[PDB]
Design a protein around this motif. Sequence first.
Motif, PDB file in Angstrom:
ATOM      1  N   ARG A 127       0.824  -1.204   0.000  1.00 39.13           N
ATOM      2  CA  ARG A 127       0.000   0.000   0.000  1.00 39.13           C
ATOM      3  C   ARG A 127       0.860   1.256   0.000  1.00 39.13           C
ATOM      4  O   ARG A 127       0.574   2.219  -0.720  1.00 39.13           O
ATOM      5  N   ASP A 128       1.923   1.266   0.805  1.00 36.74           N
ATOM      6  CA  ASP A 128       2.767   2.448   0.897  1.00 36.74           C
ATOM      7  C   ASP A 128       3.626   2.646  -0.342  1.00 36.74           C
ATOM      8  O   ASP A 128       3.974   3.787  -0.662  1.00 36.74           O
ATOM      9  N   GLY A 129       3.970   1.575  -1.049  1.00 40.01           N
ATOM     10  CA  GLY A 129       4.859   1.703  -2.181  1.00 40.01           C
ATOM     11  C   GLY A 129       4.194   1.930  -3.520  1.00 40.01           C
ATOM     12  O   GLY A 129       4.726   2.675  -4.348  1.00 40.01           O
ATOM     13  N   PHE A 130       3.040   1.301  -3.767  1.00 37.87           N
ATOM     14  CA  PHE A 130       2.520   1.302  -5.128  1.00 37.87           C
ATOM     15  C   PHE A 130       1.043   1.658  -5.239  1.00 37.87           C
ATOM     16  O   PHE A 130       0.506   1.645  -6.353  1.00 37.87           O
ATOM     17  N   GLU A 131       0.367   1.979  -4.139  1.00 35.79           N
ATOM     18  CA  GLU A 131      -1.068   2.221  -4.188  1.00 35.79           C
ATOM     19  C   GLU A 131      -1.436   3.689  -4.334  1.00 35.79           C
ATOM     20  O   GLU A 131      -2.537   3.984  -4.810  1.00 35.79           O
ATOM     21  N   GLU A 132      -0.549   4.606  -3.946  1.00 33.57           N
ATOM     22  CA  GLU A 132      -0.835   6.042  -3.967  1.00 33.57           C
ATOM     23  C   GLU A 132      -2.125   6.347  -3.212  1.00 33.57           C
ATOM     24  O   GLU A 132      -2.943   7.165  -3.635  1.00 33.57           O
ATOM     25  N   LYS A 133      -2.303   5.674  -2.081  1.00 29.96           N
ATOM     26  CA  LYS A 133      -3.514   5.799  -1.290  1.00 29.96           C
ATOM     27  C   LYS A 133      -3.550   7.141  -0.571  1.00 29.96           C
ATOM     28  O   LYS A 133      -2.517   7.690  -0.179  1.00 29.96           O
ATOM     29  N   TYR A 134      -4.757   7.676  -0.414  1.00 28.23           N
ATOM     30  CA  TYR A 134      -4.930   8.899   0.347  1.00 28.23           C
ATOM     31  C   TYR A 134      -4.535   8.666   1.805  1.00 28.23           C
ATOM     32  O   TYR A 134      -4.700   7.563   2.332  1.00 28.23           O
ATOM     33  N   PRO A 135      -3.995   9.682   2.475  1.00 32.59           N
ATOM     34  CA  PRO A 135      -3.656   9.529   3.893  1.00 32.59           C
ATOM     35  C   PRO A 135      -4.883   9.182   4.721  1.00 32.59           C
ATOM     36  O   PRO A 135      -5.994   9.643   4.449  1.00 32.59           O
ATOM     37  N   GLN A 136      -4.664   8.355   5.745  1.00 34.23           N
ATOM     38  CA  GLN A 136      -5.766   7.853   6.560  1.00 34.23           C
ATOM     39  C   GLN A 136      -6.593   8.983   7.157  1.00 34.23           C
ATOM     40  O   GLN A 136      -7.799   8.825   7.362  1.00 34.23           O
ATOM     41  N   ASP A 137      -5.966  10.126   7.443  1.00 31.47           N
ATOM     42  CA  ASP A 137      -6.707  11.268   7.965  1.00 31.47           C
ATOM     43  C   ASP A 137      -7.708  11.796   6.944  1.00 31.47           C
ATOM     44  O   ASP A 137      -8.847  12.129   7.296  1.00 31.47           O
ATOM     45  N   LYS A 138      -7.302  11.882   5.675  1.00 34.34           N
ATOM     46  CA  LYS A 138      -8.220  12.320   4.627  1.00 34.34           C
ATOM     47  C   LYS A 138      -9.378  11.346   4.470  1.00 34.34           C
ATOM     48  O   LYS A 138     -10.530  11.759   4.292  1.00 34.34           O
ATOM     49  N   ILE A 139      -9.089  10.045   4.533  1.00 38.54           N
ATOM     50  CA  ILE A 139     -10.131   9.030   4.425  1.00 38.54           C
ATOM     51  C   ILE A 139     -11.109   9.139   5.588  1.00 38.54           C
ATOM     52  O   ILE A 139     -12.328   9.053   5.404  1.00 38.54           O
ATOM     53  N   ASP A 140     -10.590   9.325   6.802  1.00 42.47           N
ATOM     54  CA  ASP A 140     -11.455   9.473   7.966  1.00 42.47           C
ATOM     55  C   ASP A 140     -12.324  10.718   7.853  1.00 42.47           C
ATOM     56  O   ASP A 140     -13.513  10.689   8.190  1.00 42.47           O
ATOM     57  N   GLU A 141     -11.742  11.825   7.384  1.00 37.98           N
ATOM     58  CA  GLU A 141     -12.519  13.043   7.187  1.00 37.98           C
ATOM     59  C   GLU A 141     -13.628  12.831   6.167  1.00 37.98           C
ATOM     60  O   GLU A 141     -14.772  13.250   6.383  1.00 37.98           O
ATOM     61  N   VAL A 142     -13.313  12.166   5.054  1.00 36.42           N
ATOM     62  CA  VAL A 142     -14.314  11.937   4.015  1.00 36.42           C
ATOM     63  C   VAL A 142     -15.426  11.034   4.532  1.00 36.42           C
ATOM     64  O   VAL A 142     -16.607  11.259   4.246  1.00 36.42           O
TER      65      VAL A 142
END
Lengths: 478, 522, 522
Positions: free
Chosen positions: C27-42
């Motif tokens: 997840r950290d290397g190749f997923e370009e996932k939104y930060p967990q804080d942004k996900i929690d806010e959304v």
Amino acid sequence: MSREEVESLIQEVLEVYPEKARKDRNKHLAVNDPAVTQSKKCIISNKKSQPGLMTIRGCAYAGSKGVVWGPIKDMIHISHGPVGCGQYSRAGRRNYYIGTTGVNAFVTMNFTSDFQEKDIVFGGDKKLAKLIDEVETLFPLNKGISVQSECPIGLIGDDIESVSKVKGAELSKTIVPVRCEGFRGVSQSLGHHIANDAVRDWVLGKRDEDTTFASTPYDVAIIGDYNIGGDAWSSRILLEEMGLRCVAQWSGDGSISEIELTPKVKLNLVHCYRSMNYISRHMEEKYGIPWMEYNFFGPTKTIESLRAIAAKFDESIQKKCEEVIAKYKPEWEAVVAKYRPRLEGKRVMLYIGGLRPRHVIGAYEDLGMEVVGTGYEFAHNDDYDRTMKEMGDSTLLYDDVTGYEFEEFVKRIKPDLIGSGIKEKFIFQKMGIPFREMHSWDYSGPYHGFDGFAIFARDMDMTLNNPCWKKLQAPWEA
Amino acid sequence: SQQVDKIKASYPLFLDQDYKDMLAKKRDGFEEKYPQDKIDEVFQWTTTKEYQELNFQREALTVNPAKACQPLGAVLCALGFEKTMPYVHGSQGCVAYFRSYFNRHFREPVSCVSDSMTEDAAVFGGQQNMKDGLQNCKATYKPDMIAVSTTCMAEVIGDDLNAFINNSKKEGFIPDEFPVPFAHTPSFVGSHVTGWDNMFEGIARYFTLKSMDDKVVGSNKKINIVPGFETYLGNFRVIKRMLSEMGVGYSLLSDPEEVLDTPADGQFRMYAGGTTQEEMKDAPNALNTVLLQPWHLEKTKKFVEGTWKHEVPKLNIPMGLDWTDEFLMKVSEISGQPIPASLTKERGRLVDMMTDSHTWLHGKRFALWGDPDFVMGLVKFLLELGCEPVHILCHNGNKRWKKAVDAILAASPYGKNATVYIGKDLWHLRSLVFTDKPDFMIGNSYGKFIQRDTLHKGKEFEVPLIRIGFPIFDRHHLHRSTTLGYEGAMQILTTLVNSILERLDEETRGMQATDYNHDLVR
Amino acid sequence: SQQVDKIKASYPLFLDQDYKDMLAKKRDGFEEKYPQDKIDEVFQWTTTKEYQELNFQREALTVNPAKACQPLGAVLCALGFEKTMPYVHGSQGCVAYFRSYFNRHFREPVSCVSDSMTEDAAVFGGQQNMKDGLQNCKATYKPDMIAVSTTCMAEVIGDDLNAFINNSKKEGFIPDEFPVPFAHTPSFVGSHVTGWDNMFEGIARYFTLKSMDDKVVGSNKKINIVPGFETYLGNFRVIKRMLSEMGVGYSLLSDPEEVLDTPADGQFRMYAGGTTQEEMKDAPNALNTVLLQPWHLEKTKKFVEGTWKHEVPKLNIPMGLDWTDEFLMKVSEISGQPIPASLTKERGRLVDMMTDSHTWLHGKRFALWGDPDFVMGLVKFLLELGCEPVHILCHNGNKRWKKAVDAILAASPYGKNATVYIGKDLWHLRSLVFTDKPDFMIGNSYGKFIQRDTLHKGKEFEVPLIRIGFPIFDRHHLHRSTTLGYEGAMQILTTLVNSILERLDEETRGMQATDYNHDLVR
Ligand code: ICS
Ligand code: CLF
Ligand code: CLF
Ligand SMILES: [Fe+3]
Ligand SMILES: [Fe+3]
């Protein structure tokens, strides 16, 4: 409605009984007449129940183990005798408590000796000593042991006092023998008396020579409140908001430590007079602690009791009491404004145990309802004297009512609600009459204090105004 | 404080901050309780195997038993008969407890009377108590029959039920022809199922012993069904339905289904349909007698074989596939009726559900407890489902029943880890589920506390409870379920598989943690 | 790594440390996932009122609908006839999906065929496909009747079912006398229940329209029963049982109970008992026709009233107390049979259970969804029980049904806080249960995700799901339950009360925290 009508109803229901049964049952049915405080008003109580009549009373073991001794948390209560009495009484009463069950709290658990035939034939004293040894082995954090006798124990001549003394000396543990054999007495009231005597003889005077505890001019002890559904906590929050310090609490969320601390208390607030009056009188005689009754059922009785309690202290306590009453006025005002129109003018009949048939009338009349009938299973003439003032004129009073008597009374009076125990609940639900459990609060609660009054109003409206009662009759029948 | 729009009962009212502070002040001021470190240490100690050994070394102390006294079963058996009043000779507190227990389980009125014996009765013997009680009961409640059981208090003082009833009849307290069967039900011997056995034997002996001359086996072309201590109405209903489907004439003796399921229509019926006295009298004319629960009907079996001369089949309880099939085959053999296609289709549908749910049922570990016949049938059905009954507990079992269950477990590869315990209580089972954790535990409501204890150890140690047995107090209308026959097998299978699926769903509900297994299709 | 003694499936295998580390690294290397804080806010934003208004402003996007297309209901209707093969004229993917859906719901074989129309059939029409498919199906699976539905592809290009079947018969592909009823079931009109209506109308018109000359109303002294789209076998069973107990001659048309509950005995029966062609032909001779689900049987009602000259009663679905009473009273009025004592006793027992469980049921708030008639009956029963159906959702409802449900709600004091939604999907319901939180939600398995969402907002915001409706995928053998009549009312009552009690027991299991309310008796 009419006194003569009620008397005619009594004489009509008494017809089916034989001569002796009719004669005995006549003295236990009465029509209320206020300003009469005696056993003259055709009401005799605390007598042997008539055999074969399907009564409701319990036994002395029920009054001792299940009422007085059971709710004490950090104590192990052993039902000495056969499996049975201990099993049927396990977690039957909702005496709430806080603790880790099995480690330092044991109210829910069931400890028994499980008497077999050999224990009946050869006695059970050595078995009791071994049982105490095993209890100490497997439950280290218990703060005391009480043994509750069942019928065979008193029948077969088992000396539990000697075993209790010897084992208590050996283990330095408080081991309390209670001779609450079921055949003793006529009902749970003798169980209350025996349990109170055991408390006085083996627990109360444990710290008489001690003076470590620090007293305070505002020290009170709640006695007779068994925390049914949290009632004791709901009353204690009101008492402590007034500035008092509730040192002891008998016996719902109670420990042996505060039972031993009770003799250091300035004032003993008795909720259940019927079960704790013996210990209240003993404490008044010995330690000189005054005791006063109180009622926290409904805002009117709650306010009256709070003012009476604050009257026994200085002016600061009374000012705090007025502050508490003012703070809690809007909540119960809103509750009554919401629920009184749905309950106004409804007739209620009650059949409960020692004093709840009279203590709950204030809450019912504060919601707009009238109690048209009441009675007791094991109350003494003192309770009837107290309730004759509370009951309205020309209202039915019944003592140790049988199934047929209560069935016929309900058939003829036709009340809108009946408050009683579990053994008549489904009988009256079949009849199509709303029913409320006045022992366990129908697993709701608490009913004490202002929060308790809110819950009580909600429950009364819920049961009385339920649509199911309107659907008892099939549409294709007339 | 309270809000009128949202009124809070004890939960969660006592979770408010003011109540929390008051309770903390009370605890820290006057309860003198041990520090939470000591409490936690002792709790952790109670979950270990050293505490298990200490627990299983018990010999005099019983903690949280799973059984009752004989007069409870005697009262149930008496209720199984038509217009019959249960009459317990002894103390009234026992009757109050019996009525409360049965009311809480069934949520129905339960009728029982006592003679209210007291100190004076303990000194002199309760003969006048019996006379006045019989007179009052027959006058007030007008029963067709009065069935007399005993309280342990009357058993210790050695009251003579036969002589007392005979003297009540001689002195005109009750008519001579009025049926008053009796049974000695000592509470210190056996358990409630023993009381059911004793009461049924007493009633049968009352109605048949003196009329044995003119009875011919097989005259009425019927089969006698003796159910035993049964608290599921669906079991009576399913036995009757299967026997009517087969075209077999039957006589269900001690049928309390109607009295425990009376309708609510504005009228209260003290008595509903039951086993009439005519069926009890004509019972020795039946082709044979089948005991549904033979492991607590030993005295009844002896009486029926010796006196009625019925060849009672060696049948297990009709629980699950194999034993229901054996029961139906024996009934067909006795009555001469072939098994209809409806029952074959029902068995096929049960096998269909078995094959559908075998994937989720296979390999699961269960700790179960209850009555001997019920526990044995549940163990057999779990073995048929590919489940492992790791802990088997029966407080009111014996050595021969343990041998039978051990032989049942040996004949299957899924009973390899099983261990039967007799004479053990629920504290023993708490230790067992702590030291050898099963997936689920099956039993009555008293297991809920055990579940709580496990959850206190940790979420990964919780053992959920499946409520099958007696008594069930914290759930509503579970007494209408079935455990006998293919219908009962279907209900049990559905309950087990769906409990497994709810547990799996709950364990996989965590988003971005375990929700990858929160499958829509299972 | 896997322990051979304890093998871990995906749960809890992927909670291991190596899997956790590998997943985190990926997840950290190749997923370009939104930060967990942004996900929690959304997520917190998605559980709000502003998001609710944005979601309810939708007009073109549908998220998580609760409905299917017409050919599914057409197939279900066709399965209820004896030796009948459902035949969907169109593309094979539709039939594969229908079979998978019904297999997952019923856990039973589901037989349906397609003519596998492709690009060539899309351009040139599918009449050759019709001829070949009808001939192949009759030759291979040997049905007594083939019932033809349509796929949206065939409905768009205007394939003439009548002309195609007539040409198939006239060219010798099938016998001229072989019954091939047909129905046009456009997937862009209505929903699956509409397809059921269309298929039943087509079959009835096929078997009755031409032979109307010799038919007399009431000749056979029977009442026709049209059950509509039903997925509970217990509903068919209870309707037949109630009518038979009442001594009423009935003809249940489109009975799929046998084919969806085939026994597993080593033999596969593609066809089981259903409605015969003789029953369908004799249906006009009945006294009257009763529609169990009148809110999706409009076309059938129109045909029956216009052709058969039956005066179809204005009855609701027999769900709950009042509506079952009306159904039984109307059946008695039509047939002249008095209502027996068994049904009166069953109604009394239902009333008794209501009385016993009213304290726990009263005041509870429910969100709920499903088909129109089922939702209507569930709301009626909830109002009878004293509950509050706060969120009533029906994706395939209309204005008339909404008006009827609003009138039902306004007739009871418990409908004051109830809102009916039509044309809304389960994303709308997720917003509603986040904003106006109910105690429970009653629906199909698709609600489980909603529950998961609520649990992510906190344990105190979780809305449990009660699985009543269609489809139920994550539980086993729930399709055997009953919903109609007194039996269905008892089953629903038991499910609701025991769900409430399970939730209360879960909320009070914390020792020293909330276990003061962990009551043994409830
Ligand atoms: S103790 Fe007594 S019968 Fe005072 S034995 Fe009984 S929890 Fe009653 S009227 Mo059940 S004298 Fe308490 C009582 Fe009252 S058990 Fe409770 S409700 S206030
Ligand atoms: S009046 Fe009271 S409850 Fe009755 S026995 Fe006596 S102390 Fe106990 Fe006990 S085991 Fe059963 S329930 Fe009895 S018959 Fe004996
Ligand atoms: S072959 Fe494939 S699954 Fe079939 S339609 Fe075509 S893309 Fe879709 Fe769709 S709505 Fe229902 S299921 Fe069809 S009839 Fe149309
Ligand atoms: Fe009931
Ligand atoms: Fe299947």
